[PDB]
Design a binder for this molecule. Structure first.
Ligand SMILES: [Ag+]
Ligand SMILES: [Ag+]
Ligand SMILES: [Ag+]
Ligand SMILES: [Ag+]
Ligand code: NI
Ligand code: NI
Ligand code: NI
Ligand code: NI
Ligand SMILES: [O]
Ligand SMILES: [O]
Lengths: 570, 100, 122, 570, 100, 100
């Protein structure tokens, strides 16, 4: 018996060689392999295969290799590959990627992926499944930002803030032991993973270090607090001892140094360069040269992503509003023109495509959009396909190489940079079961279901009063993962080793899973999956032209993007 | 009024439908959520008018045509489902492939 | 190049199910007055008593149909179905409690089937 | 001094012999007796009777027979009677039904119903008061379902689910120890009583039983997991040892047996038959014959309730959507026509009226409406009055006999079946103070106030910014019973004896009241209040005609229902 | 805009009133919540116009008549209450027995 | 529809704008929130129409004039900001001193 490949893909999702369009982009992903045994595919429902004595084992207790949860027939899109597999979850972690069911009667069953009495089923046939997004440039300004992030497939927020205080509205900073303690206790109520950054500013060690001991997962150096050689040097000294990451927003004004003075203060130590293109902040005009150095893990914020006809007009005005610039103070006008630059924003698209910028991030509510890191990553890949063509590395007419390079920017690479990739950032065995299901038609635009530690936290679903859940209105809603005490077991507060050793979770009564920040100081650019390129980036101080290998990087702004007016009510 | 949760939510559909109809009246091709809102509100207003489930299953396929909506939108909408109070109580209407 | 968001471009060719397993055709009759629909992965010898077929030929086997589909028998209907071999450990537990072990114990399965009135134990 | 009976009923609510119309139905309830002393009626307000030295006692401490709460002048509608009484509450339980006030000066005061310094007052004069609804067919798919239930007078949800996972979207199942633990901790946040069902599937005992030990209150056998003779037999073996109830959705497809094969597997043990008519699931076409057996506690789900002109067209399409049926696969068409049957849906109205189906339930978000169990119960009683006339048992031109038979279906009978009627399911002394006040005009449609453990949890009330609470907009809102830690003291998590003995509440940090499931295995049809009828139900396999006492049960679908377009904005 | 909780909620009444007025314009007898929404929005729009409490107490009894609404609806509505910002601040209007 | 949080919130602006436009049509001078709603909805409907950020920065200064609004309202509104989906994705429009 044979099934033609159209009926096969309609029943079980696609298989080896089948391609899938990402939303309404020109980007195609190809199934690279499939863990199934054709005919023994797992599926759940009336008269289906996962039933007692059949594809569901009726013998084994939960401990005897039985799953808490099986996602059937997932099309996985991850830095590790684009492929078809069942995903098994147990104790809130991914324990098996392979072939689920019952070894009683089925060939090819991964030994620890038994569907048993204890197994819940999520049908992923026809869905794309990715890791949860890791947003490492978050301002905690407004709690309503969390659902915005969940709705576009973000599962981890790293940054800082105490709410809509000016310090927090400008900088990813929860300053000092008390604010860090208050925001750790706030975090108990936020249905997403969180890590908090302290203020990376001081000329003595103790005022900085006491933030790491209080529970900070990292530091932020921001020009608004003084991105001086001293604040840079002390923060990195603290980070090398504490094994946490430092994010930098450099001295845009060149007040105490040019870019080379900042790099000298860094002195070859590991650092996360935020909004490396520089519209979001940094050494005017040449900050983006950071992205060529091997000790720099470079990230973009999302409003420059990608370069469009409205980008420059929007940004000149955004900066005027954000900075209270006056169009009748020539210094304010010179400043804006020195900072919002089509030459660098245009080059930023191509650096992303070449794997020279490793990461995306939002800059949520400070200078960036909480729900558009995933959205604008795929808009950039699609624009670069249109302008630059398939990358040389591609084969079979698929965009798998570009898709792995771009999915890495908001999954694995921010996890590696932050020191949290042992827990999150990819669909691999042994990592926390933070999983996003997407309908291909909505891929990168609106997540179907967001799974946090093996329970659904967020879903597009309809009328709660209805016979079935699909009637209108279908909207994003918090699910049982977010209710009562289950919000503690489904989410991770990431903390420094020292705060963990010093008992800060028990001191503060934190009930959330505690994640350990580690292995941040021993990495560089080369550890950025698919995005590992070091090069001499030249930025002309007169023209702002960007050169790599003595070649000018430029492209056109586009009039139209996919994943926009087809999808959005506003 | 004694609004229950569903009455509160379904007010939103009527509003989205009004917004979408305004956008069509100034000559825009409608997008995915606009189209879904229009056909949804149509069904719920039909139930309020006392039409039968069978009538609205027929009528729902003729509220919008592919020339009312952007490229790909007909193919993004497999069906549109809504529950409304008919004279004989709450019933479910599904309109299959509402736009060709 | 009309864009259907999320559309498939499936490769050429067909997917063979249950590749390399022995196939067997048997005639089966619903002697009951109510319909019976049988799924892809139920041990064929353990189906509804009122289905008449050579029960021995259901042992160690299931319907050779795509995963999660079914064969339907209207009241009084007789028709042919194709079976394929169970895989894995070739063991069955529960369902109708006729096997609870290796599918190799044909005598014991048929003895239990006959005693409980599963039609067609020969 | 005499008051005419129109002014009396306007001031104090109705008294012996007075009748009240239920909403806009043709159904009339008659006050059977009144516990008051005419002239010593309790009431609260400016210059009223419950004042210090008068109807409020000024001497007694709370412990000395003083109430926490008095509901004055309630018209109670319960399986125990339709009558007028004050209802006294203390420590979250109903301690007294009788006559409240101050024995200093009042005749007829129930000794433990003293209004004292510690007493709150709720004015129930002119209200109907019922027990909270017990919905025993709940799918936990979307947390927004809870307010939907509260708004139509449901106070207890029994069922299963982990949120919008396919296993939970089809079956009332929280599978295995981990999912049951995660949903017990979720339940901490749900302002309603809850009991969780495990997966009633396996061929060994341990994989099933470990669910009861982890905290499940019962099991669900569902055809989607394999409703095989083995899964039925093992689940009932587990339930007989653990003293919990089993719900069944039988093998619609007749794959492993006909109805008689399922009854043989049950082997005379007690079982809850879900959606016994069978549109919701079961042995095609004759599942409804379950409702004649003395070991079967039979429930309807609500979308077949009652039989209307749109019912069949709605259901054929609901089933096609729910099952992904294709109108070009004749097997899918035969299946639908074998399952959606006017003959059984029509008979289902009359079985309800004859007391042969004992219970209503929702099937919330799987194949049924979370907020319409109470609504559709009264729509059925009203339709049956119109088509069948007053039942013989009636007297005085009232529908009291029918009203007791129908209120029993969503109050006491599901409580008895689940093993929780010692705590909930009726307005009787010693039970938890889960109470629903209704304006007669809204009776069965929209609850006025829902009381959970003696504190209001949900209320139709207006503008929070207003001088008084009655200005628009009046809508359903969560009240102080649902806020902070009071959500723990006002609600019950129902659990198995073994999980209670094994310390699961302390293991998981549950702060909710713990209710014990018990006395489920020693009951049958005869324990169903007002709905105790056993008979030989014949379902013709060719015509689907239903016979009881060799008489065809048929009725007409109606074009119009009460409790519909007069009330609902959508 | 600086919307406070009440401004957010009362937007809903205006929307329900618009929905109800549309339903009356296509010739439907209005139901309980429709009728309450219409008269409520009338009062709040009256306060915005600068009418007095006494005017709206009078006018409110003539917005809908029994022939505008279904059987029993006049008798279900004992009164309709709303608070709105008059030129002299927030005041409460109660319309007693608005529909005979 | 797949409404995200922002789609849900921004529906409210359109509704407030409809309410405000009705109030202007019966000859009322508009207040602070009415004026902000009108200009806000104008921007978001402009983005849906496919206008550029630069166009809406110009047009936004001519939607309302001081004679449309009460005393002091022009001076209470320093600017009006809104984000909407343009054909090239979400962008921020700020209209500076929209009413003189
Ligand atoms: Ag700024
Ligand atoms: Ag800024
Ligand atoms: Ag179904
Ligand atoms: Ag169904
Ligand atoms: Ni910055
Ligand atoms: Ni920032
Ligand atoms: Ni069922
Ligand atoms: Ni169900
Ligand atoms: O930033
Ligand atoms: O069900």
């Amino acid at each position: 018996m044979k099934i033609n490949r159209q009926q096969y893909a309609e029943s079980y999702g696609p298989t080896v060689g089948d391609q899938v369009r990402l939303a309404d982009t020109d980007l195609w992903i190809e199934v690279e392999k499939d863990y199934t045994t054709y005919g023994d595919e797992a599926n759940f429902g009336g008269g289906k295969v996962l039933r007692e004595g059949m594809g569901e084992n009726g013998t084994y207790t939960r401990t005897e290799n039985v799953l808490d949860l099986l996602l059937t027939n997932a099309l996985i899109l991850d830095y590790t590959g684009i492929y078809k597999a069942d995903i098994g979850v147990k104790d809130g972690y991914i324990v098996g990627i392979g072939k689920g069911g019952n070894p009683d009667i089925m060939d090819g069953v991964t030994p620890n992926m038994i569907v048993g009495t204890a197994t819940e089923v999520i049908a992923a046939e026809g869905k794309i499944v990715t890791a949860g997004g890791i947003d490492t440039h978050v301002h905690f300004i407004n709690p309503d930002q969390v659902d915005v992030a969940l709705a576009n497939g973000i599962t981890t927020l790293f940054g800082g803030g105490t709410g809509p205080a000016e310090g927090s509205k400008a900088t990813t900073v929860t300053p000092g032991p008390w604010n860090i303690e208050k925001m750790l206790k706030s975090t108990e109520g936020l249905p997403i993973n969180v890590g908090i950054l302290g203020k990376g500013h001081g000329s003595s060690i103790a005022p900085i270090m006491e933030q790491i001991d209080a529970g900070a997962a990292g530091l932020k150096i921001h020009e608004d607090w003084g991105a001086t050689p001293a604040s840079i040097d002390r923060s990195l000294t603290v980070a090398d001892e504490a094994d946490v990451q430092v994010a930098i927003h450099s001295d845009t004004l060149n007040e105490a140094g040019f870019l080379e003075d900042t790099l000298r203060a860094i002195n070859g130590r590991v650092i996360h360069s935020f909004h490396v293109e520089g519209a979001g902040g940094g050494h005017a005009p040449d900050i983006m040269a950071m992205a060529g150095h091997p000790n720099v893990l470079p990230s973009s914020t999302n409003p420059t992503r990608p370069f469009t006809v409205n980008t420059i007009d929007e940004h000149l005005d955004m900066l005027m509003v954000c900075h209270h610039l006056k169009q009748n103070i020539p210094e304010d006008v010179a400043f804006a023109d020195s900072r919002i630059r089509p030459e660098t924003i245009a080059a930023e698209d191509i650096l992303h495509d070449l794997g020279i910028i490793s990461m995306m991030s939002t800059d949520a509510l400070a200078m960036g959009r909480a729900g558009e890191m995933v959205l604008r990553t795929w808009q950039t890949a699609d624009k670069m396909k249109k302008q630059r063509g398939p990358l040389a590395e591609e084969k079979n007419g698929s965009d798998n190489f570009r898709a792995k390079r771009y999915v890495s920017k908001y999954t694995i690479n921010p996890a590696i940079a932050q020191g949290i990739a042992h827990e999150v950032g990819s669909i691999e065995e042994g990592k926390f079961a933070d999983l996003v299901l997407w309908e291909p038609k909505f891929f990168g635009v609106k997540a179907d279901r967001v799974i946090k530690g093996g329970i659904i936290a967020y879903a597009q679903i309809g009328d709660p009063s209805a016979s079935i859940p699909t009637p209108q209105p279908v909207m994003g809603r918090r699910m049982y993962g977010t209710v009562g005490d289950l919000i503690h077991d489904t989410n991770i507060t990431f903390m420094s080793k020292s705060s963990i050793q010093q008992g800060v979770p028990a001191k503060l009564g934190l009930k959330r899973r505690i994640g350990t920040v580690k292995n941040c100081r021993n990495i560089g650019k080369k550890d950025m999956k698919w995005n590992d390129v070091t090069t001499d980036i030249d930025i002309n101080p007169e023209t702002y032209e960007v050169k790599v290998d003595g070649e000018v990087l430029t492209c056109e702004p586009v009039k139209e993007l996919p994943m926009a007016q087809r999808y959005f009510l506003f | 009024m004694h609004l229950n949760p569903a009455e509160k939510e379904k007010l939103q559909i009527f509003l989205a439908s009004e917004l979408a109809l305004k956008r069509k009246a100034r000559g825009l091709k409608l997008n995915y959520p606009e189209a879904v809102a229009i056909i949804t509100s149509f069904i719920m207003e039909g139930a309020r008018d006392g039409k039968t489930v069978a009538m609205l299953m027929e009528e729902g396929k003729h509220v919008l045509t592919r020339d009312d909506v952007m490229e790909g939108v007909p193919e993004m909408i497999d069906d549109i489902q809504a529950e409304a109070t008919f004279p004989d109580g709450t019933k479910l209407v599904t309109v299959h492939n509402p736009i060709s | 190049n009309y864009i259907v968001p999320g559309e498939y471009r499936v490769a050429e060719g067909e997917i063979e199910i249950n590749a390399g397993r022995e196939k067997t055709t048997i005639r089966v009759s619903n002697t009951g007055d109510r319909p019976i629909q049988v799924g892809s992965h139920i041990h064929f010898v353990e189906v509804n008593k009122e289905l008449l077929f050579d029960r021995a030929e259901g042992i160690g086997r299931r319907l050779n149909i795509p995963s999660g589909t079914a064969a339907r028998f209207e009241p009084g209907e007789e028709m042919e179905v194709e079976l394929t071999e169970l895989g894995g450990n070739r063991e069955v537990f529960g369902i109708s409690d006729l096997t609870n072990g290796s599918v190799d114990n044909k005598e014991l399965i048929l003895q239990r089937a006959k005693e409980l009135g599963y039609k067609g134990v020969e």
